[PDB]
């Protein structure tokens, strides 16, 4: 079975440095076309950089967006391919995959993608706020998840114990460059006076673990 | 580069349907055109090889037509496993380019929202901010028109909208838009609207509430 395994993604502040890693395993690493392809919500699928067989020196080759920024290289008797990244800016977010080019044709093998976050923002916990069912059936009810940094949060609703009508929402980024989601979920109206909801939030890049009691307001 | 420029964004298909969808190149791009499935949280999986030839272990149901500068991808019979993303890419030319993407999801009856507004909570606003939040749950199709009105202004550009993946189990959606104002702002106005416009409501809904009312 062919695999490739990346590894080295992480948070870096715009103008920093990251290096990315790839072992691959189940072919002859040595003859074959290695590439790094990013993607982002923005701008899609883009190739990024190349690095084919020391029989052809070993010829390196680079995305016009890139070039003079990054630099890839091999280690065939490690199987590795290396992406080394210098000057990072905003839009170089993204997930990058390590990939297999057959010869100047299909990108016919995949890795599973590091994430790379380029921000300025420092890391931070979030701050919890009840969202309390309507004092005017099915209730809503929820809890704002407002202003952390990075990615990601966890909510859980009583431990755990409540599922079955949750929706979390994906997180947005804020202008302020902090993420703010919210967690919902509908009951039985009737179920109001009789069960407490608690959602649990979890940051852990912050160590920030948040019980929030969402009831009626008075 | 080469552009590919793949459509729909966004094909809605019923279970046990022949689908297909588009990519179109800029210019001539040959037979160089191969075709990429992407499931949620997953790598991208070379299908389709040249055009029309398929892989070794992809399912038949799977063909690829097209030469020149437009390609179609078919799936004779969508399975559930098929609710993916699909990407073109062509290597007629260096650099190697991708399609934006289309991404195939469950067709099922129209759902309207059930719609709830949210006022800002006593604790945000001791903090010096207001979000309001106005919740779109479970309707389909994706497509709803959420508009806010404060005071009967519309607002703009100080919202953000999130919206769910598709229910595994029921097919919809849901939505969430959030107002973010200032407290001094917050607190110069007193009727806050959210007004949804969706196709499987009769008319559009409105959930509005006067500020410091309960």
């Known amino acids: 079975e062919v695999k490739l395994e990346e590894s080295g993604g992480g948070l870096v502040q715009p103008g920093g440095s990251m290096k990315l890693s790839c072992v691959a395993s189940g072919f002859i690493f040595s003859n074959h076309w290695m590439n790094w392809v990013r993607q982002s919500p923005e701008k899609g699928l883009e190739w990024v950089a190349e690095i084919r067989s020391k029989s052809i020196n070993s010829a390196t080759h680079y995305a016009e967006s890139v070039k003079g920024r990054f630099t890839i290289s091999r280690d065939d008797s490690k199987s590795a391919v290396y992406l080394q990244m210098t000057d990072l800016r905003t839009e170089d977010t993204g997930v990058y995959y390590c990939?297999?080019?057959?010869?100047?044709?299909?990108?016919?093998?995949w890795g599973q993608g590091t994430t790379l976050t380029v921000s300025s923002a420092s890391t931070k916990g979030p701050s919890v706020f009840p969202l309390a069912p309507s004092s005017k059936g099915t209730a809503a009810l929820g809890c704002l998840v407002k202003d952390y940094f990075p990615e990601p949060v966890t909510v859980s609703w009583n431990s755990g114990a409540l599922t079955s009508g949750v929706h979390t929402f994906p997180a947005v980024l804020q202008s302020s460059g902090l993420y703010s989601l919210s967690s919902v979920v509908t009951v039985p109206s009737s179920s109001l006076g009789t069960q407490t909801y608690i959602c649990n939030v979890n940051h852990k890049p912050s160590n920030t673990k948040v019980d929030k009691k969402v009831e009626p307001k008075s | 580069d080469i552009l590919l420029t793949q459509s729909p964004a966004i094909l809605s298909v019923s279970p046990g349907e022949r689908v297909s969808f588009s990519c179109r190149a800029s210019?001539?791009?040959?037979?160089?055109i191969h075709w990429y499935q992407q499931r949620t949280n997953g790598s991208p999986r070379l299908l389709i090889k040249?055009?029309?030839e398929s892989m070794s272990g992809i399912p038949s149901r799977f063909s690829g037509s097209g030469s020149g500068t437009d390609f179609t991808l078919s799936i004779n019979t969508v399975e559930s496993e098929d609710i993916a993303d699909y990407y073109c890419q062509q290597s007629h030319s260096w650099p190697f380019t991708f399609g934006s993407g289309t991404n195939l999801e469950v067709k099922r009856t129209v759902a309207a929202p059930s719609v709830f507004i949210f006022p800002p909570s006593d604790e945000q606003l001791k903090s010096g901010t207001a979000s309001v939040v106005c919740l779109l749950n479970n309707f389909y199709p994706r497509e709803a028109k959420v508009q806010w009105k404060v005071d009967n202004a519309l607002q703009s550009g100080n919202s953000q909208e999130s919206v769910t993946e598709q229910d595994s189990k029921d097919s919809t959606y849901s939505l969430s838009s959030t107002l973010t104002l200032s407290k001094a702002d917050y607190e110069k106005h007193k009727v806050y609207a959210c007004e949804v416009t969706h196709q499987g409501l009769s008319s559009p809904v409105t959930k509005s509430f006067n500020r410091g009312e309960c």
């Open positions: 040249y055009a029309s």
């Open positions: 210019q001539f791009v040959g037979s160089s």
């Open positions: 990939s297999r080019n057959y010869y100047g044709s299909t990108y016919d093998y």
